Symmetry: D2
């Protein structure tokens, strides 16, 4: 069961080599997790203004085949693990058009749920609405 | 005596055509105005963490010659006009290396000083430190 | 102003990486969106031109402009509405309305303009080429009004 | 004299366009900075390789990684400190410390890693090429030690 974020590669994501510059794959992880929040946990999205922080702990990408301008890429996100305050997600980046389905890359990211009164910020349980959305 | 912001073109600013993607020239206006504040208006720089915001009203670029990866570009900023709450700046983008000095592009931008209130962003006076810095260091 | 556009529409959802500490969309992103919009237009309405862009054709930006009216925020749905202003041998002048369509009422965030030249990479640098017929026809049919 | 090996230092000042509404540096910018750092390294220490990158040589990223420890802010002066982890054939593994050096006390913001492969454009694809001697030479001055 994966969450699909659809992304069309633009010229500004390419580079003189002719492929998608590597760092854009990490932005797409972000676009995907944020679109998930908006689609299935809007209350957590709203809570980000209040006092909830979703902080990136780490991220990773493995690159397999080159993406090009106008490629339609599915950024397929899965829950790898939820533990107290941390959420680990994994990502397949699959070109679905043009040509045959092609795995361009894979990735991983961990996010921590924090609350931040005073000066520092402290771990808080993954919110219920988010925990609920994540299981589906 | 324009204010000079030096920028080395990186691969992530290029594109498959082989040149600097046009929209990066606009980011460089931002980089240049921020570097200007750190150099010449550090009190204003501090107010930007304390509720002051520089809000873009308009911007413009004219492109003359292609930029490439590893080009050293001088983003040369000049003050065009100050009013109550607005600053108009102009920019020459000059490749200084490799090869001979080459005007790649020119640009313009108007910025407003704003503070965030209950309704949203509201106009405030340009701080005197910034008006003086621009009149002295970007003319 | 209107929910319904009369122009070519490129839909864009604002992401967190397009915001900045002020809390709005950083101004330079609006210029990227002109590029995203014109590329989406090619894929929708001039796919033969899209293919020529891998075969020596280049769209070179001559100039661009934006006027900013109201702030954009993360997760705003923005319509980047593109209209043909002028077609002149090898140059295309296009205008843009940036309309927030959600949340809240339709709001003009910004307007913009851009001139692009159709060029081919040659043994002289870049050389002007006439606007491809497919693109000229697509712009007259999909980006007028 | 220097027990710990030196690292290559790429200086980066955080700009507003690298921040986000949360108020910190958006995480994906740290990966761009690896790119900026490795390119600045080539311009400083392997300029012949830098020229070959306009002449058909390409550095192709195989993988990359970042661990985030403390928030970066607009106007922070960040040193992106690069070291060679290993050179394995046509592949180069580099590691990165991201250290805020101003304002305030030196602060480790993040660490990172990246593997790159040296390739050349053949047809419509790329093929492995040996790491150029100049680049091998330049990276070995910043080797991580056991
Ligand atoms: C099955 C997929 C589950 C995905 C869970 C996604 C969680 C994403 C959290 C995103 C947080 C983003 C935070 C900011 C500040 O950008």
């Amino acid at each position: 069961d994966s969450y699909v974020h659809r992304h069309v590669v633009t010229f500004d994501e390419t580079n003189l080599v002719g492929n998608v510059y590597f760092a854009h794959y990490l932005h797409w992880q972000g676009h995907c997790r944020e679109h998930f929040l908006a689609d299935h946990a809007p209350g957590v999205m709203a809570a980000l203004a209040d006092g909830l922080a979703l902080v990136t702990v780490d991220c990773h990408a493995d690159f397999y085949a080159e993406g090009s301008a106008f490629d339609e890429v599915e950024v397929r996100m899965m829950l790898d693990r939820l533990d107290g305050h941390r959420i680990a997600m994994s990502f397949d980046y699959v070109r679905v058009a043009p040509g045959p389905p092609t795995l361009l890359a894979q990735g991983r990211q961990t996010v921590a749920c924090m609350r931040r009164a005073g000066h520092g910020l402290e771990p808080v349980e993954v919110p219920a609405e988010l925990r609920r959305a994540l299981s589906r």
